[PDB]
């Protein structure tokens, strides 16, 4: 869980996203009040995936305005033949950032 | 040029999309009755790219069960520095499916 706001600053974050309701009202309970994601997910019947992208699109969206998450994910056109190297470089742009020796 | 969606077929795509009324009914128009996108942004106020959105995002969920896109988009964990040279394998994966000289 990253850290939580109030609402003033959470409107500010959710001005910037054209979303649906669902991951405002997510990111109401979860980074305003500071309730944890995992029940969050069982309690609406949202999945995982889904109540953690609610987190992470209106808290970058805060963030854009200040300093955001240091983390880049590039997304390019290429064929599927560089996609057998892209499966490995995944976790291998991680394991330059990573101290697991 | 592409094809439209019968009301049968497009139920088929909503069904496994995850958005809103606004976007489902740009394509309701738009692919349903085959017409031009460019006078349905005018018409909702929305943008070029938005609208284009909607219609690639029905026409997507149909795409992956029948027939999709010519560009695929690869994703990878790389960063910013990689992407220099990223850039330009985006340009010539393009520059591999359309014949320019």
Known sequence: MKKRLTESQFQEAIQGLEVGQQTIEIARGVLVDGKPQATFATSLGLTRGAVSQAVHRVWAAFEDKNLPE??????????EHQAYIV????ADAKKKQETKR
Do not use: H, N, S
Not at 70 to 79: C, H, I, K
Not at 87 to 90: A, L, T, V
């Open 70 to 79: 240091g983390y880049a994910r590039v997304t390019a056109v290429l064929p």
């Open 87 to 90: 499966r490995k470089w995944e």
